[PDB]
Design a protein around this ligand. Structure first.
Ligand SMILES: O=C(Nc1cc(/C(=N\c2ccccc2)NO)cc(C(F)(F)F)c1)Nc1c(Cl)cccc1Cl
Ligand SMILES: [Mg+2]
Lengths: 1340, 69, 103, 502
C-alpha cells in the first residue's frame, strides 16, 4: 500500500488476480525518439545509422573525400517552459565532426592534406519532452506512430474478379524499405511476368537475362532433366520411378525383360512401387514420345559446326533424326507436368522478345525511361542502381528478416540489397505456389503489418536531408581548390533544418496533441495510423484492412477507433501491448507448462502466437492454478472453441489486454453493445476538465494509472517529508537512503499554474499534500486538471433519475436541475490567447500607443499609459485589450461630409483604429500579458514595466532556490559534524558561513564534508550563472516575422458554467444536450425530500443497447449509500471502532474477492481520514470483463439501507403527488464534452466578402453565412418557392449589386428584390470567353 | 438507364453542371448550340426565377410572349 | 491549397477590403437627406452659398471668389454669410439631426 | 498556350518554386469535387445562422425557439429601419449604436419585426423537401435553438448534438412562400405517401399508451360516470385509477349526414384513461378510435382519419393536443427502467444444455464418421439457431403475459405492465429484436469472411459477456457502422442520378 492509498481506497470487485500490472502507458513514444537521437557505436537505427549510410561522401573520381567522424547535440537554447511561452521550437543544435581528405593525385593512397573541420553546424532538431511530446511553435505536438506493410516478400492471390475465368492468378511482390518495387505476376495463359514498380509488364525471363543468364541456364534453374539415350538404336529413357505419378501410360512401358505397365493403364502407386523395388533405371521408349518434349540445352553438329536445335525448343520426329546421325548420344529435356511441376518458364521464354544480356538491359532501360535512346552504360548503370546499389536500395533489418523467413531460409540477417539467388528463389517460390505446394499470405495479418514511430520517421526525413546535402557536397567537390574551403562552405543549414521542420511542422501524422484532457493526451500518444506517407488512403484501401482481424487480439483495441471517413484505419494500441524487437506487435501471455498455469510472462508476436493454443483470461482454476474444467474455451489458430484440459500451451495475462486504455475506463463494459461502447470510449476523450476535479464514483481501476502516467500530475522523484507546501511550489526533504552523498539536497517541485492549453481550456495544478506530511517515492504530490488524489476524474458523478419528464428529455435530451449550475460543479474555465500585431505599412509604422482616435474615457480607462490592459482587469465583448493604430492618410471625403466637418470643426485623424478588442460575446479575466519586441527597437513603457517586474521575480525565485538549497546542504553538515565531532550547542552558535573550516576525526566522514564543500560552492556559482542567463533571456528581443515591429499577447481566462445547448454524455455512449435548466422546485424527489440532479430518458436505454449505464447507475446509488451512512456516522462522531467496523464490512462484501484490507493501518489518525474522504461516496473499481455482478450490487444495497430494485418512490416537485410505478435512481458519472453552445452558435447578417468571387466570407471571426448546397436547393425546388431560391443564390449572396440594393430596401421598409446576375456565372462568362469560345446572351 | 438518360439535355449549361465540363463546352460550341434555358438547373445557375412553382406564372407569361406577336 | 485537402484554397480566403460595408452605405444615402433638409432650413441665398462653397449635389466645388462672381456680390461678403450660416446650423435643433452623424 | 487553356493534356507544367501543377482556365471552369460548379457544391448566403438544438415541448407545432442574440444579429437591418421608422433613432448610424449598445428599447422593436415574419430551418442531411421547414420565431433566452418534437421525425434529427441552420426570408414573396408552402402546418403528410409525417414519436406515444390500457383490478373498478369530465375529476383526486374497466356515458358525433354532424350518446364500456383522453378528440370522430390500446400505429391512424374527415386545422390542433397530453401523462406515469425490468427465461439454461447435447451428438457422429464435415456444420448451426428461437419465444411469452393478478377471485393474467415491455409494444422505442438481445442469448456472429461461427453468443447484455463473445461482437459492430455510413453515400449518389434524370 502507498500513502495516497491511505487517503482513499477504491473498493474492488472481481476475482482474477492481476499477474502482470499495467506498464508505462507512454512507453512507445519515449522509446522511439530514445532510439533516434542517441550514440550507438554500430549500425543500429539512430542518427549514427543514417549518417553511416550516406557517408563517407567522395567526389567523382577526383579523390576528394568527405568523411563523417562523430556528432553531438548541444544544450537547448530555451527550456520547455520558456520555449513554450516565447513560441520558438524546443530543439538542439546538431554539431557534426567532418574530415575532409584530399588524396594526392596518382595513388598509392595518401593525403596531401586532411582538414578536420570542427563540428560544422547543420540544422537544429526537435526534442521529445518527458511526456512524449514535441513543441513546434510554442505548442505541444505529437507524432502518431505509423502502421504499414512490412518490407520483404509477399505472395498474394487475386482470385475471383480478374478475368472472370475463375482460374485465379498468383502474384509475388518484393517491397523494400526504400527503392523501387519488384513485382512478379502470372496471367491467364500461365506466362510468368515481371514489372518494376507499377510500370509496364515484361516477360519474366527478361530480368534473368539481365543477371547474365543464357536460356540454357534459365531452363536449368526452373526445370528438371529428362535424359534420352540412343544406345544401340531407336532410343531409350532414364526413368525415375516417381516421375510416372499423376500420368497415364502413353505406350507399353517395359524393361528388364519384364513388362511393368501396359498401354492405357494410368501409373498408380502399385506400378511405381514395383518399379522402385525392381529398381528400373533405364527403359526403352518409342521415337514418337519425344514429339512433344522440349530440349533442355543447345545442340550442334560436331562436324558441320552448325546449330541443330536451340535451347527450349520443341522436338519433332525429324529433328531427332537430324541430331541423331550427327553422333549425339544423350539428349536433355525439360521435366514437365500440367499438374505437379508446371512448364511455365518455357512459355515465358516463348514470349520473351530478347536474347542476350545487353538486349534485356535495353528493353528494361527503355521500360523505365521510355522514348529516349538507350545506351550500354545507361542500361547497366540503371539496372545496377535499381535493386543492387547499396545507395538507392535497402530492405534493412526487418526487410531482410521477413524476406528470408518467408523464403524458408536460415539466416535471419543479411545484406540490404537483392542478390541473384534472392530474386531467383522468389520466382521459384511463386512457381511452387502455382504448382500447389505452399500458400498465399494475407495483408490484414499483423505479422505482415509493421509499426513505426516518431524516431524512425524523423530518421527518414533527416536521411532525405542528408542525400540532398550529398548532391551539393559532390557538386562543390567537383571544381574545388585545395586548402581553402573546408567542411563548412559546402554543407548548408537550411536544407536539413527545413527538412526536419517540414516534418514536425506539417505532416498528417504530426499534429497538435489533443490536450483537453489527461485521457485525451495519453490516448493520442498511443495511436496507430495506416495513413500518411508510406501508407494507403481512405479513398484507396477497401473494407478488409479497416476490419478487425483475430491478430488484433491483445495488440490492437477492437472497440476503440474513430467512427467516420476513416474507420479502423486508425484504431489504438492495446493496454498491455508492446512493440516487437523487429517492430511487430506482441502481447503478454502466461506460459502453461505441463498441467500448471505458471505466472511467468511470455511475449508472442502475431506470427509467434499462431500455432500455440492460448487459454482464456476468464477461466476457472484454483490452488496450484490447475484448470477446473475438463475442457475450457480457448483459441489456437485463427479460431476459438472448446479445448482439452491439458492441451493448453499458454493463457491470457489479464482480463483487460484485449481492449485499450480508453475502453478499460468503461465500467460494466461487458453489458454494453460494441457500437455504443465505441461511441463511449470515443467521447470519453472529449471531456473538458471541470472546475472542481471530482472523482469517478463508479470506476475501473485504470484511472489511477492514466492520471499518473500522463504528465498532467506531478509525481515525487523521491520520498521524504514535505518541508514546504504552496499553491505555487512544493519542497520535499529527501530521505537519506535514496539521497546521493554529494550536494545533500531537497527535491523542489515548481507547479504549473493557470496557463493556456492547446484546446483553449485551462490547465492548472493543485497540491494534494499538506505541510509536513510523509510521502512515498513515486507518489502524487499534486493533481493536474481533471485528476483527484492520484486518480482520473474526467467529470463529475451526480444524482440521476430515469423517467420521462414532460418531454423535456425527449430524444437524448437531458433535463438538469438548478442545483448543478448553482453548485458550479460542471462549470469550466477557458484560457484564450489573443494577439495584437504591430506591422509596417508603406504609409507608416503602427503604434501600440494608448492614444486612440474616437474612444470614450471609459474605453481608455482599462488601458495604461502605454495602451495595454492591466493584469487582472475583468473584460467583456467589445473591451479594448490592446490599443493599436495604423496610418491611413488623406481620407478623401465627400461634399456633405466636408460641410459636416466645416460646421463641427473636427479634424479627421490620419490614423485608423486597429486595436485588438475582445471577440463579441465572450467574457473573462486577464491573467497575463506578453510583449515581443524586434531586437533593437526601443521597448515601450508597459513592456519595460513588465520586463523589470519579470527581472525582479526571477531574482527572487533564484534567491529562494539558493536559500532552500543552501540551508538544506548545511543541515547535513550539522548532522555529519556531530558524528566524531559532536558539539550540540557549541556548533550552532558561530556563523554558519564559517562552518566549513571545522574538521573531524580521521574517517570517510571528513571526505563527506569535503563533498558537501565542493557541491556547495558549485551551487553558489551556479546561482550566479543562472541569474545572468535568465536576465539575458528576459532582455533579448525575440526574432519576429518580416514587417512586424512588436506583438502583444493578452491571456483571457473566461468562465462558462453550463447552458442549454451544451453536450453531455456518460461513459456508455449515451449522448445528450442539456435541454432546460429546471428549478430545484420542480425536481422529482424522494420520500427523504432529496431532489435529483439530472433526469434522463428511459426510452434511450432499450433501443441502443447499453445496459451498463443502468448497472453503473445502480452500483453508483449503492456506492453513494455507503457514503451517506458514513456521512451520518461521522456527523454522529461515534468513535474509531464503529466507523472502522462499518468500513471493513463494506470492504469485505460477501465472499470471494481479491481486495484485502486494513487494521494494518493506524487505527486513529489514519482511518479517520479515509472515512473523511469516503463520505462524499464510496469509490468502487469495476474491472473491464472481471467486473461486479448483480448479486454483489444488491448485497451492497442491503449494506446501504437502499432497495434491491434500485428504484424508489418519487414525487413531482410540482403537484407533490407520487409518481405511479417505481423509478430507477442512482449516481451516473457524467462528463461534459467541449461542444459548448457558445462556441458552436453563429449568426451573420451582412459581413465581409470574398475578392475573387463576391461571396460572403468571414474575415473578422465574424462568421461567413451558412452554405446553401445543391440538396437544399432541391428542397426549395420541391416546394413552389422560386423567390426564396432566387433571393438565396442571388441577392443574399452572389450579387454584388443586389445585396446592398436589398439592404437599403430592408431598412426602408420595402421588401422586394432587383436581382440582376450572380457574379459567379458572370465570372464563368469571362473564363469561357478567355478561351477560344465565344459565349453570348441573345435577344431581349 | 437513368445515368444514361441524364446525359441528354437540350440546355448545355445544364450539361456542364453534372457531366464532364471540358467535353460538354466544346461539343456544344462546335454546333453553335443555343441554350434557351427553360429548365430548372440552368435557371438556377444563371440566377433567375425557377421555371416552376411560384415562378411558373412568370416563365409562362414569358414563354408565350416569345415566338409570337 | 490550405488544409483539409478540400476545395479550400488560399485565394478563397482572401477577403475584399476594397468594398464598402452596406451598414455605412445606408448612412451615406441618409446623410444626403439630412443635409438636404438642413439646407432647406437656411435662406435660399445662404443655401446657395453653402451648396456652392462645398460640392453638395453639384459638379466639383467652388472657390470663394468663384462664389463671388456667380453671386454678383463678391469677396469678404460671402465669407461672412458662410460663417453666420454655419452659425445657424451650429446650435441645437438645427444641429441635433446632423450632430448624430459624427462618431 | 495549351498549358494555359487546359493543363495536363501534354506535360503538366508546374508553378514557380512549387511542385503542385498550376491551375489552368479549364480547371477554373470545371471546379472540383467530381462535378461541382459552385451553384452545385454550395454557396455562402447572408442573413443566416446556426446552432445546437433543444426540445421545447411548450411550442405549438407552427413555431420554434430562436436565441435572442441570434435574432438580433439576423434581423439587424429590419431592426435599424424599424428603429428609425418610429423615431427612436435619429439616423441609421445612431440605430447601429443603439443595437450595438443593446439598449432596452430595441427588444420590443425586435418583437415587432419578428411577429408575422417566418424563418427557415434546415438540417445537415437534406434529402426530402421536409429537410427544410418554416417556423414562426419565438424569442428565447439562451444560445440554443428550440425545435418542436413532432417535426423531429421529418428532419431525422436526434438531440445528441445535431445542429440546425436558420435562414431569413428577406423579400415579401419569400415570406409568403415560406408561410404558404415551407410552413410546418402546411405539410402534415409525406410527399412519398399520404401517411402523416407528424406522427407522434416516443415519449408521447408511451403516454397515450399508458393512459388507455386496462389492468385487471384497480381503483373504481366497475363503476359508472356521467362524462369524461368527472372521469378525469375522479382520476386526479386519486379516487379512481388511470386504468380500470368502467362504463361511462359519452357523446360522439358523426358527420355522416350531408355536410352535417349527427350527435349520439351512449354508455360505452371503456377505461378511465380512455375517457379522459376522449376530451381531446375533436367533433365527428367516433369514440371507437380511442377505445383501443393506442399503439404507435393506431395513434397514427387516429390522426390520419381525423385529417381525412375534419380537414387540416382540426388535425393540426388535434395533433398538438395529443403531443401535450402524451408528454404530461407519460411524465405522471413514472415509467422507468431498472436492471430487474428485463426478465430472463427460467428455462434458458435447460434449452442451452439440450441444444448443447445435440452438438456433442453430431460431434460423436463425425467422430464415428456417420456424417460428413460440412453436413455436420449445417447440423450444429441448425440446432444452435433453433435454440436461439426457443429462448427468444420463451422470454417473449414470459416477459409478455407473466403478470398474474387477482380480481375478486383467485387469479387471472393479462399483458404485462412491465416498463421495457410497454416501451417495445407501444412502439415508443425498442423492439423484439433488441429485447431478445437484452434477456435471451443474442444470435450467432459471422467472421468477416461471412462464415457463420458455430459457437453463438450464449450470454446476453443483462448477463455478462466474456472476452471472446465481445471480441466476436466487435466485428459485427464495425461492419454495421461501416455498411451504414456507406449506404448513406450510396443513397446520396442515387438521389443525385435521379434528380439529374428528372
Ligand atoms: O478472421 C477469421 N475468423 C474469425 C474467427 C473468429 C472466432 N474466434 C475468435 C475469438 C477471439 C479472437 C479471435 C478469434 N471465430 O470462432 C472471430 C473473428 C472475428 F473477426 F470476428 F473476430 C474472425 N478468419 C480469417 C483468417 Cl484466419 C485470415 C484472414 C481473414 C479471415 Cl476473415
Ligand atoms: Mg444523430
Amino acid at each position: 500500500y502507498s500513502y495516497t492509498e491511505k487517503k482513499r481506497i477504491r473498493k474492488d470487485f472481481g476475482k482474477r488476480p492481476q499477474v502482470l500490472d499495467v506498464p508505462y502507458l507512454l512507453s512507445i513514444q519515449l522509446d522511439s525518439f530514445q532510439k533516434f537521437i542517441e550514440q550507438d557505436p554500430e549500425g543500429q537505427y539512430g542518427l549514427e545509422a543514417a549518417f553511416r549510410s550516406v557517408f563517407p561522401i567522395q567526389s567523382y573520381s577526383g579523390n576528394s573525400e568527405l568523411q563523417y567522424v562523430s556528432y553531438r547535440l548541444g544544450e537547448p537554447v530555451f527550456d520547455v517552459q520558456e520555449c513554450q511561452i516565447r513560441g520558438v521550437t524546443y530543439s538542439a543544435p546538431l554539431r557534426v565532426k567532418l574530415r575532409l581528405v584530399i588524396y594526392e593525385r596518382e595513388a598509392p593512397e595518401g593525403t596531401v592534406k586532411d582538414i578536420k573541420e570542427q563540428e560544422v553546424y547543420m540544422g537544429e532538431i526537435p526534442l521529445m519532452t518527458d511526456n512524449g511530446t514535441f513543441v513546434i511553435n510554442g505548442t505541444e505536438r505529437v507524432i502518431v506512430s505509423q502502421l504499414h506493410r512490412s518490407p520483404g516478400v509477399f505472395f498474394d492471390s487475386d482470385k475471383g474478379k480478374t478475368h472472370s475465368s475463375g482460374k485465379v492468378l498468383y502474384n509475388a511482390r518484393i517491397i523494400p524499405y526504400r527503392g523501387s518495387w519488384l513485382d512478379f505476376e502470372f496471367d491467364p495463359k500461365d506466362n510468368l511476368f515481371v514489372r518494376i514498380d507499377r510500370r509496364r509488364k515484361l516477360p519474366a525471363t527478361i530480368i534473368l537475362r539481365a543477371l547474365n543468364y543464357t536460356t540454357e541456364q534459365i531452363l536449368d534453374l526452373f526445370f528438371e532433366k529428362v535424359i534420352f539415350e540412343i544406345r544401340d538404336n531407336k532410343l531409350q529413357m532414364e526413368l525415375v520411378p516417381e516421375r510416372l505419378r499423376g500420368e497415364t501410360a502413353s505406350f507399353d512401358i517395359e524393361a528388364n525383360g519384364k513388362v511393368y505397365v501396359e498401354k492405357g493403364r494410368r501409373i498408380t502407386a502399385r506400378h511405381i512401387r514395383q518399379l522402385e523395388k525392381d529398381d528400373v533405371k533405364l527403359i526403352e521408349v518409342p521415337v514418337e514420345y519425344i514429339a512433344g518434349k522440349v530440349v533442355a540445352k543447345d545442340y550442334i553438329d560436331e562436324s558441320t559446326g552448325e546449330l541443330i536445335c536451340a535451347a527450349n525448343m520443341e522436338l519433332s520426329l525429324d529433328l531427332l533424326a537430324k541430331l541423331s546421325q550427327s553422333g549425339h548420344k544423350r539428349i536433355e529435356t525439360l521435366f514437365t507436368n500440367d499438374l505437379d511441376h508446371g512448364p511455365y518458364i518455357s512459355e515465358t521464354l516463348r514470349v520473351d522478345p530478347t536474347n542476350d544480356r545487353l538486349s534485356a538491359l535495353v528493353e528494361i532501360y527503355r521500360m523505365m525511361r521510355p522514348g529516349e535512346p538507350p545506351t550500354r552504360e545507361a542500361a547497366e548503370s540503371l539496372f545496377e542502381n535499381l535493386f543492387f546499389s547499396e545507395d538507392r536500395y535497402d530492405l534493412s533489418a526487418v526487410g531482410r528478416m521477413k524476406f528470408n523467413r518467408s523464403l524458408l531460409r536460415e539466416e535471419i540477417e543479411g545484406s540490404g540489397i537483392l542478390s541473384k539467388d534472392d530474386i531467383i528463389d522468389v520466382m521459384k517460390k511463386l512457381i511452387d505456389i502455382r504448382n500447389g505446394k505452399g500458400e498465399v499470405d494475407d495483408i490484414d495479418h499483423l505479422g505482415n503489418r509493421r509499426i513505426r514511430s516518431v524516431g524512425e520517421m524523423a530518421e527518414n526525413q533527416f536521411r532525405v536531408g542528408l542525400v540532398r546535402v550529398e548532391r551539393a557536397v559532390k557538386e562543390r567537390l567537383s571544381l574545388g581548390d585545395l586548402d581553402t574551403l573546408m567542411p563548412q562552405d559546402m554543407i548548408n543549414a537550411k536544407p536539413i533544418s527545413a527538412a526536419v521542420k517540414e516534418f514536425f511542422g506539417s505532416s498528417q501524422l504530426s499534429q497538435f496533441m489533443d490536450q483537453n484532457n489527461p485521457l485525451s493526451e495519453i490516448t493520442h500518444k498511443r495511436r496507430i495510423s495506416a495513413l500518411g506517407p508510406g501508407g494507403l488512403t481512405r479513398e484507396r484501401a477497401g473494407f478488409e484492412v479497416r476490419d478487425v482481424h483475430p491478430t488484433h487480439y491483445g495488440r490492437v483495441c477492437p472497440i476503440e477507433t474513430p467512427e467516420g471517413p476513416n474507420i479502423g484505419l486508425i484504431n489504438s494500441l492495446s493496454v498491455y501491448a508492446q512493440t516487437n524487437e523487429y517492430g511487430f506487435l506482441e502481447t503478454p501471455y502466461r506460459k502453461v507448462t505441463d498441467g500448471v498455469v505458471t505466472d511467468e510472462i511470455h511475449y508472442l508476436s502475431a506470427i509467434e502466437e499462431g500455432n500455440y493454443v492460448i487459454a482464456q483470461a476468464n477461466s476457472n482454476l484454483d490452488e496450484e492454478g490447475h484448470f477446473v474444467e475438463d475442457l475450457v474455451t480457448c483459441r489456437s489458430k485463427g479460431e476459438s472453441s472448446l479445448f482439452s484440459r491439458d492441451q493448453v500451451d499458454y493463457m491470457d495475462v489479464s482480463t483487460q489486454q484485449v481492449v485499450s486504455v480508453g475502453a478499460s475506463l468503461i465500467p460494466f463494459l461487458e453489458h454494453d453493445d460494441a457500437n455504443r461502447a465505441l461511441m463511449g470510449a470515443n467521447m470519453q476523450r472529449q471531456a473538458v476538465p471541470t472546475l472542481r476535479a471530482d472523482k469517478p464514483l463508479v470506476g475501473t481501476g485504470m484511472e489511477r494509472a492514466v492520471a499518473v502516467d500522463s504528465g498532467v500530475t506531478a509525481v515525487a522523484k523521491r520520498g521524504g517529508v514535505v518541508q514546504y507546501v504552496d499553491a505555487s511550489r512544493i519542497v520535499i526533504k529527501v530521505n537519506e537512503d535514496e539521497m546521493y552523498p554529494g550536494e545533500a539536497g531537497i527535491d523542489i517541485y515548481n507547479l504549473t499554474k493557470y496557463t493556456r492549453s492547446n484546446q483553449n481550456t485551462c490547465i492548472n495544478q493543485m497540491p494534494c499534500v499538506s505541510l509536513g506530511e510523509p510521502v512515498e517515492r513515486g507518489d502524487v504530490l499534486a493533481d493536474g486538471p481533471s485528476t483527484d488524489l492520484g486518480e482520473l476524474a474526467l467529470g463529475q458523478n451526480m444524482r440521476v433519475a430515469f423517467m420521462p419528464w414532460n418531454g423535456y428529455n425527449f430524444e437524448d435530451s437531458i433535463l438538469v436541475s438548478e442545483r448543478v449550475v448553482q453548485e458550479d460543479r460542471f462549470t469550466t474555465i477557458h484560457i484564450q490567447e489573443l494577439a495584437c500585431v504591430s506591422r509596417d505599412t508603406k504609409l507608416g509604422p503602427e503604434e501600440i500607443t494608448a492614444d486612440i482616435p474616437n474612444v470614450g474615457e471609459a474605453a481608455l480607462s482599462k488601458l495604461d499609459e502605454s495602451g495595454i490592459v492591466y493584469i487582472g482587469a475583468e473584460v467583456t465583448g467589445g473591451d479594448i485589450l490592446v490599443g493599436k493604430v495604423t496610418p491611413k492618410g488623406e481620407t478623401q471625403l465627400t461634399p456633405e461630409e466636408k460641410l459636416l466637418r466645416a460646421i463641427f470643426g473636427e479634424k479627421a485623424s490620419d490614423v485608423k483604429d486597429s486595436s485588438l478588442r475582445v471577440p463579441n460575446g465572450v467574457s473573462g479575466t486577464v491573467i497575463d500579458v506578453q510583449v515581443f519586441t524586434r531586437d533593437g527597437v526601443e521597448k515601450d513603457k508597459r513592456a519595460l514595466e513588465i520586463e523589470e517586474m519579470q527581472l525582479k521575480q526571477a531574482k527572487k525565485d533564484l534567491s529562494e532556490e539558493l536559500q532552500i538549497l543552501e540551508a538544506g546542504l548545511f543541515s547535513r553538515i550539522r548532522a555529519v559534524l556531530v558524528a566524531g565531532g559532536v558539539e550540540a550547542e557549541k556548533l550552532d552558535k558561530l556563523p554558519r558561513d564559517r562552518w566549513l573550516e571545522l574538521g573531524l576525526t580521521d574517517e570517510e566522514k571528513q571526505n563527506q564534508l569535503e563533498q558537501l564543500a565542493e557541491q556547495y560552492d558549485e551551487l553558489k556559482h551556479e546561482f550566479e550563472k543562472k541569474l545572468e542567463a535568465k536576465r539575458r533571456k528576459i532582455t533579448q528581443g525575440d526574432d519576429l516575422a518580416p514587417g512586424v515591429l512588436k506583438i502583444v499577447k493578452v491571456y483571457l481566462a473566461v468562465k462558462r458554467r453550463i447552458q442549454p445547448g451544451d453536450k453531455m454524455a456518460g461513459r456508455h455512449g449515451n449522448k445528450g444536450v442539456i435541454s432546460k435548466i429546471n428549478p430545484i422546485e420542480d425536481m422529482p424527489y424522494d420520500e427523504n425530500g432529496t431532489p435529483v440532479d439530472i433526469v434522463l430518458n428511459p426510452l434511450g436505454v432499450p433501443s441502443r443497447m447499453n445496459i451498463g449505464q443502468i448497472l453503473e447507475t445502480h452500483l453508483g446509488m449503492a456506492a453513494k449509500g455507503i457514503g451517506d451512512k458514513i456521512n451520518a456516522m461521522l456527523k454522529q462522531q461515534q468513535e474509531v471502532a464503529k466507523l472502522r467496523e462499518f468500513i471493513q464490512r463494506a470492504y469485505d462484501l460477501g465472499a470471494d474477492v481479491r481486495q484485502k484490507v486494513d487494521l494494518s493501518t493506524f487505527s486513529d489518525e489514519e482511518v479517520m481520514r479515509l472515512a473523511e474522504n469516503l463520505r462524499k461516496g464510496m469509490p468502487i473499481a469495476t474491472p473491464v470483463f472481471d467486473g461486479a455482478k448483480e448479486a454483489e450490487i444488491k448485497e451492497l444495497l442491503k449494506l446501504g439501507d437502499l432497495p434491491t430494485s434500485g428504484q424508489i418512490r418519487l414525487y413531482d416537485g410540482r403537484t407533490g403527488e407520487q409518481f405511479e410505478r417505481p423509478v430507477t435512481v442512482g449516481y451516473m458519472y457524467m462528463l461534459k464534452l467541449n461542444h459548448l453552445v457558445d462556441d458552436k452558435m453563429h449568426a451573420r447578417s451582412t459581413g465581409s466578402y470574398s475578392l475573387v468571387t463576391q461571396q460572403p466570407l468571414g474575415g473578422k471571426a465574424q462568421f461567413g453565412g451558412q452554405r446553401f448546397g445543391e440538396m437544399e436547393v432541391w428542397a426549395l425546388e420541391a416546394y413552389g418557392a422560386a423567390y426564396t431560391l432566387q433571393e438565396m443564390l442571388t441577392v443574399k449572396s452572389d450579387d454584388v449589386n443586389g445585396r446592398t440594393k436589398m439592404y437599403k430596401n430592408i431598412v426602408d421598409g420595402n421588401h422586394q428584390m432587383e436581382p440582376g446576375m450572380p457574379e459567379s456565372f458572370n465570372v464563368l462568362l469571362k473564363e469561357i470567353r478567355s478561351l477560344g469560345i465565344n459565349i453570348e446572351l441573345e435577344d431581349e | 438507364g437513368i445515368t444514361k438518360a441524364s446525359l441528354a439535355t437540350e440546355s448545355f449549361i445544364s450539361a456542364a453542371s453534372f457531366q464532364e465540363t471540358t467535353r460538354v463546352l466544346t461539343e456544344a460550341a462546335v454546333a453553335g448550340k443555343r441554350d434557351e434555358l427553360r429548365g430548372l438547373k440552368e435557371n438556377v445557375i444563371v440566377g433567375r426565377l425557377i421555371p416552376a412553382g411560384t415562378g411558373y406564372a412568370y416563365h409562362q407569361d414569358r414563354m408565350r410572349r416569345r415566338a409570337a406577336g | 491549397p490550405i488544409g483539409d485537402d478540400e476545395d479550400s484554397h488560399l485565394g478563397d480566403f482572401i477577403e475584399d477590403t476594397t468594398l464598402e460595408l452596406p451598414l455605412d452605405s445606408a448612412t451615406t444615402e441618409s446623410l444626403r437627406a439630412a443635409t438636404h433638409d438642413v439646407l432647406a432650413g437656411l435662406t435660399a441665398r445662404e443655401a446657395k452659398v453653402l451648396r456652392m462653397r462645398f460640392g453638395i449635389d453639384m459638379n466639383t466645388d467652388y472657390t470663394l471668389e468663384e462664389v463671388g462672381k456667380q453671386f454678383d456680390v463678391t469677396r469678404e461678403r460671402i465669407r461672412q454669410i458662410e460663417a453666420k450660416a454655419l452659425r445657424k446650423l451650429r446650435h441645437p435643433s438645427r444641429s441635433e439631426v446632423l450632430r448624430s452623424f459624427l462618431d | 498556350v495549351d498549358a494555359l487553356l487546359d493543363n495536363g493534356r501534354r506535360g503538366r507544367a508546374i508553378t514557380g518554386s512549387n511542385k503542385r501543377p498550376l491551375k489552368s482556365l479549364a480547371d477554373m471552369i470545371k471546379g472540383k469535387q467530381g462535378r461541382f460548379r459552385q451553384n452545385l457544391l454550395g454557396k455562402r448566403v447572408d442573413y443566416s445562422g446556426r446552432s445546437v438544438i433543444t426540445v421545447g415541448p411548450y411550442l405549438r407545432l407552427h413555431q420554434c425557439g430562436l436565441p435572442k442574440k441570434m435574432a438580433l444579429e439576423l434581423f439587424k437591418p429590419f431592426i435599424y429601419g424599424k428603429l428609425e421608422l418610429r423615431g427612436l433613432a435619429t439616423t441609421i448610424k445612431a440605430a447601429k449604436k443603439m443595437v450595438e449598445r443593446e439598449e432596452a428599447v430595441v427588444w420590443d422593436i425586435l418583437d415587432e419585426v419578428i411577429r408575422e415574419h417566418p424563418v427557415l430551418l434546415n438540417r445537415a442531411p437534406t434529402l426530402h423537401r421536409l429537410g427544410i421547414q418554416a417556423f414562426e420565431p419565438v424569442l428565447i433566452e439562451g444560445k440554443a435553438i428550440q425545435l418542436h418534437p413532432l417535426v423531429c421525425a421529418a428532419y431525422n434529427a436526434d438531440f445528441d448534438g445535431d445542429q440546425m441552420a436558420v435562414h431569413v426570408p428577406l423579400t415579401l414573396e419569400a415570406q409568403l412562400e415560406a408561410r404558404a408552402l415551407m410552413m410546418s402546418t402546411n405539410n402534415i403528410l409525406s410527399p412519398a405517401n399520404g401517411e402523416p409525417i407528424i406522427v407522434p414519436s416516443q415519449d408521447v406515444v408511451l403516454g397515450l399508451y399508458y393512459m388507455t390500457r386496462d389492468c385487471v383490478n384497480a381503483k373504481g373498478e366497475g363503476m359508472v360516470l356521467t362524462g369524461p369530465k368527472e372521469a378525469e375529476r375522479l382520476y386526479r383526486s386519486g379516487l379512481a385509477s388511470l386504468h380500470a374497466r368502467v362504463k361511462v356515458r359519452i357523446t360522439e358525433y358523426e358527420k355522416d349526414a350531408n355536410g352535417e354532424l349527427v350527435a349520439k350518446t351512449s354508455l360505452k364500456d371503456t377505461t378511465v384513461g380512455r375517457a379522459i383522453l376522449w376530451m381531446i378528440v375533436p367533433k365527428g370522430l367516433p369514440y371507437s378510435i380511442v377505445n383501443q390500446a393506442l399503439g404507435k400505429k393506431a395513434i397514427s391512424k387516429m390522426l390520419n382519419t381525423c385529417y381525412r374527415i375534419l380537414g387540416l386545422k382540426p388535425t393540426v390542433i388535434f395533433a398538438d393536443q395529443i403531443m401535450y397530453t402524451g408528454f404530461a401523462y407519460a411524465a405522471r406515469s413514472g415509467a422507468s427502467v431498472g436492471i430487474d425490468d428485463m426478465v430472463i427465461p427460467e428455462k434458458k439454461h435447460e434449452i442451452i444444455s439440450e441444444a448443447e447435447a445435440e452438438v456433442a451428438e453430431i460431434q460423436e457422429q463425425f467422430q464415428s464418421g456417420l456424417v460428413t464435415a460440412g453436413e455436420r456444420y449445417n447440423k450444429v448451426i441448425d440446432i444452435w439457431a433453433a435454440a436461439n428461437d426457443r429462448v427468444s419465444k420463451a422470454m417473449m411469452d414470459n416477459l409478455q403475459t407473466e403478470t398474474v393478478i387477482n380480481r375478486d377471485g383467485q387469479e387471472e393474467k393479462q399483458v404485462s405492465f412491465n416498463s421495457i415491455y410497454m416501451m417495445a409494444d407501444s412502439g415508443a422505442r425498442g423492439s423484439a429484436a433488441q429485447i431478445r438481445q437484452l434477456a435471451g442469448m443474442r444470435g450467432l456472429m459471422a467472421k468477416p469472411d461471412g462464415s457463420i461461427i458455430e459457437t453463438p453468443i450464449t450470454a446476453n447484455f443483462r448477463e455478462g459477456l466474456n472476452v471472446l463473445q465481445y471480441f466476436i461482437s466487435t466485428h459485427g459492430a464495425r461492419k454495421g457502422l461501416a455498411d451504414t455510413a456507406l449506404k448513406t453515400a450510396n443513397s446520396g449518389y442515387l438521389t443525385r442520378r435521379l434528380v439529374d434524370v428528372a
